[PDB]
Amino acid sequence: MIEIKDKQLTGLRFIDLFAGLGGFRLALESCGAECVYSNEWDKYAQEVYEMNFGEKPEGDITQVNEKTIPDHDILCAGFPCQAFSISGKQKGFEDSRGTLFFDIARIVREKKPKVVFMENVKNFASHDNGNTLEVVKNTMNELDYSFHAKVLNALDYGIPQKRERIYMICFRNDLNIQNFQFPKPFELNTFVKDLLLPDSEVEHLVIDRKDLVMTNQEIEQTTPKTVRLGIVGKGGQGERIYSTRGIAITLSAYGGGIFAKTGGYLVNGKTRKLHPRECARVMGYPDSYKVHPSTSQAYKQFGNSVVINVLQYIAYNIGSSLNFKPY
DNA sequence: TGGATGCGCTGAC
DNA sequence: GTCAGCGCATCC
Ligand SMILES: Nc1ncnc2c1ncn2[C@@H]1O[C@H](CSCC[C@H](N)C(=O)O)[C@@H](O)[C@H]1O
C-alpha cells in the first residue's frame, strides 16, 4: 500500500461488510476514515481480522437487523463472487452465495450512507448479458444513489498482478456529486521479482515435477503482463508457471492445481508457488499485516481479497469529490 | 468455516 | 485454438 499525505476521509465513518482480511479497512483508514462496524462470518477470517484490528466481526449478515448497524458515511462491500466469476458455474442470483447484494441494499435503504463502495470480479460486469450489473445499478438508483462502475486492472496502479475487478461507487443523490473519477492508470515499475522473499524462506514451496514442460524462454526484460513459461500436468489452473519479470496471475480463494491459489513461478532455476507473505505483497498489503497461522486459510483469504493500492486511489477520489463543496 | 490437488465449462480474445 | 479465472469436485 502507499502513503496518503492528505487524509481526504478524515472525520468520516465507514462499515466493513464481507470484511475478510479487512482490505477496505486498511485502504479507508489510510485516508483518515474511521471503521465503526465490521461483518464477516468465516471463522478463520474473523481470527485474522481480530489479529490485525483487535475486533471480531459480527457473523452472518443475513441474520443481522440492519437497524442495529451503526450510522456511517461509507458502506464498503467486496461481496461474494463465486456465483459470478468466470472461473465458476455462473449461477449468479440463483446461487445461495449470489444474493448477498440484496442484503447490502437492505442495509443501505435503512442506513442511507453518503457513499456505497462495492467490489466484485470482472465477469460480474458482463454476467447474464449485463443484466446482473444492470440490476445493481437500478437497485442503487431506486435507493436514490448515483452509480459509477468501472473495471480496473491492478497492474495499472503500481501492483504486479493482472487482477481485474469491477468497482462500483455510489453517491447519495442529495450530495450532487458530479466530479467523481476513477483513478487514471500509470506506468508499472514493480514486478513479481521485486516482491519475492529470500530463497531460504521459501524452499519448502519448491516443486520439482518430472512432467514439467517449459514452453517459453525466460525473459530478461520486465514487462507489465503475465508471461507463461511452462506447465505441469495438463496446464489447467494451478498448473501454469510464470516469469517473475512479469506480473502475477490473479490470486484465487478455492483454487486447485499443484501451484494452488497463487500460480507457479520460475525463481532462480526452480519452480514454486508463492508464500503467503508474497501473496500479501502482490495484494498490496504491508509487511506489518499479520497473516493467519494456517497457510491454507491465508492463501484462501488473500485469494478472496482486494488490492489495497487500488482501493486507496479510489477512496482518495471519493474523498476528493465529497470535499469539493464550493459556495 | 480442514488440507490438497486434478480438473474443465466458459469468457474474451 | 490460445489462455485466463476472489472456482469446483472429490480424496483423505
Ligand atoms: N452471509 C455472510 N455473512 C458474512 N460474511 C459473509 C457471508 N457470506 C460470505 N461472507 C464473507 O464474504 C467475504 C467475501 S470476499 C471479500 C474479502 C474482503 N474484501 C477483504 O478485503 O479481504 C468472504 O470472506 C466471506 O466469508
Cell of A302: 488473500
Q: Are A156 and A44 part of one and the same domain?
A: yes
Q: Are A91 and A229 part of one and the same domain?
A: no
What's at A3, amino acid-wise? E
A317: Cα separation from own chain's centroid: 18
Q: Ligand 1 center to residue A262 CA distance, Å? A: 20
Active site residues of A: 81
A124 Cβ contact list (under 8 Å, min separation 6) = A81, A84, A85, A132, A133, A166
Q: How many angstroms separate the Cα of A172 from the Cα of each of A21, A113, A142, A178?
A: 27, 7, 11, 11
Q: Are A228 and A145 part of one and the same domain?
A: no
Q: Is the dihedral of CA A84, A89, A90, A92 positive or negative?
A: negative
CB A62 less than 6 A from any atom of ligand 1: yes
A313: Cα separation from own chain's centroid: 13
Do residues A29 and A35 lie in contact, with contact meaning Cβ atoms separated by under 8 Å? yes
Q: Are A175 and A82 part of one and the same domain?
A: yes
Q: Are A174 and A270 part of one and the same domain?
A: no
Q: What is the distance between the alpha carbons of residues A266 and A19, in angstroms, rounded to a whole number?
A: 33
Q: Are A58 and A125 part of one and the same domain?
A: yes
Q: Are A169 and A297 part of one and the same domain?
A: yes
Helical (H) or strand (E) element with A148: strand A148-153
Cell of A234: 495438463
- Angle, CA A205 vertex, CA A199 and CA A208 arms, to 5°: 100
Q: What is the distance between the alpha carbons of residues A220 and A185, in angstroms, rounded to a whole number?
A: 25
Ramachandran class of A268: left when φ > 0, alpha when ψ lies in -120 to 50, beta otherwise? left
Beta bridge partners of A120: A166
Cell of A194: 521485486
Q: Are A21 and A144 part of one and the same domain?
A: yes
Q: Could you tell me the resolution of this structure in angstroms?
A: 1.9
Q: Are A162 and A228 part of one and the same domain?
A: no
Nearest-atom number in ligand 1 for the CA of A62 is: 1
Beta bridge partners of A149: A168
The reply to whether the CB atom of residue A43 sits less than 7 A from any atom in nucleic acid chain B is yes
Structural domains counted in chain A? 2
Cell of A181: 473519477
Question: What string of DSSP letters covers A193-238?
Answer: HHHPPPGGGSGGGB---TT-EE-S---SS--SS--EEEESTT--TT
Q: Are A138 and A217 part of one and the same domain?
A: no
Q: Are A83 and A167 part of one and the same domain?
A: yes
Q: Are A152 and A202 part of one and the same domain?
A: no
CB A21 less than 6 A from any atom of ligand 1: yes
Q: Ligand 1 center to residue A175 CA distance, Å? A: 29
DSSP 8-state assignment for residue A62: G
> What are the backbone dihedrals phi and psi of residue A199, each rounded to the nearest 5 degrees, phi first?
-55, -35
Q: What is the CATH number of the domain that holds A106?
A: 3.40.50.150
Rounded to 10 degrees, what is the CA torsion of A223, A226, A230, A236? 180
Q: Which nucleotide is nearest to A88 (CA to C1')?
A: C7
DSSP 8-state assignment for residue A13: E
Q: Which nucleotide is nearest to A256 (CA to C1')?
A: B5
- β-pairing, A34-39 vs A164-171, is unpaired
Do residues A104 and A144 lie in contact, with contact meaning Cβ atoms separated by under 8 Å? no
Q: Which residue has the cell 437497485?
A: A139
Rounded to 10 degrees, what is the CA torsion of A57, A63, A67, A70? 0
CB A297 less than 6 A from any atom of ligand 1: no
Q: What is the CATH number of the domain that holds A252?
A: 3.90.120.10
Lay out the sheet containing A213-214: strands in order across: A213-214, A228-231, A240-243, A264-267, A270-273
What's at A91, amino acid-wise? K
A192 Cβ contact list (under 8 Å, min separation 6) = A160, A242, A243, A244, A245, A246, A247, A248, A265, A282
Nearest-atom number in ligand 1 for the CA of A61 is: 3
Instruction: Quote the domain boundaries for residue A229.
Output: 187-284
Cell of A244: 517473475
Q: What is the distance between the alpha carbons of residues A323 and A285, in angstroms, rounded to a whole number?
A: 27
Q: What is the distance between the alpha carbons of residues A290 and A272, in angstroms, rounded to a whole number?
A: 23
Cell of A145: 444513489
